[PDB]
Amino acid sequence: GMVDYYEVLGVQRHASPEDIKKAYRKLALKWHPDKNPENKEEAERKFKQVAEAYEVLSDAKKRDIYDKYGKEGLNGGGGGGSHFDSPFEFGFTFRNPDDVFREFFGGRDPFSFDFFEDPFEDFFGNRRGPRGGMGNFKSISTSTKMVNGRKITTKRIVENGQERVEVEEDGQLKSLTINGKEQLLRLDNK
Length: 190
What we know:
Elements: H1 4-9, H2 17-30, H3 40-57, H4 60-69, H5 76-80, H6 97-104, E1 137-147, E2 150-159, E3 162-169, E4 172-178, E5 181-182
Antiparallel strand pairs: 1-2, 2-3, 3-4, 4-5
Helix pairs in contact: 2-3, 3-6
């Protein structure tokens, strides 16, 4: 009948490889972890499914199998009674969906721009930019002590060459300094 991966892509069984590429790219954005983190439940599940769907469905070796079977799947060739040459299952494991998207996109929004959607030009940091960026951290020094029953924690965080000191008391930020310039926390109403 049809291959379930088509339903994952949201297309018809007669969709071309190029149309598979379309759905793949579109859904890569649509259900991207950073696109819809609010519904991470539906997003994660479908996002990962898209990885599998694309990789397998787009494989000519699997298409050969599907053509033999008639898109029947379970023992399709036997049920249909077909006689075509096809590749065999050799105990192949499942691939990390994240690695799939890493290969083809880099784990990033397919429809993003390096000149317009610059991660390092984002006040809020909703483009995988600095301020919590992986590989951007040089070194973090953490030291905690007890003062009059109070938990005093000081963190020296170096990121992108910039140093910021964070001093907390019982889990509450008391002082914050950036490159020797103390910032006023009263301005932070987030």
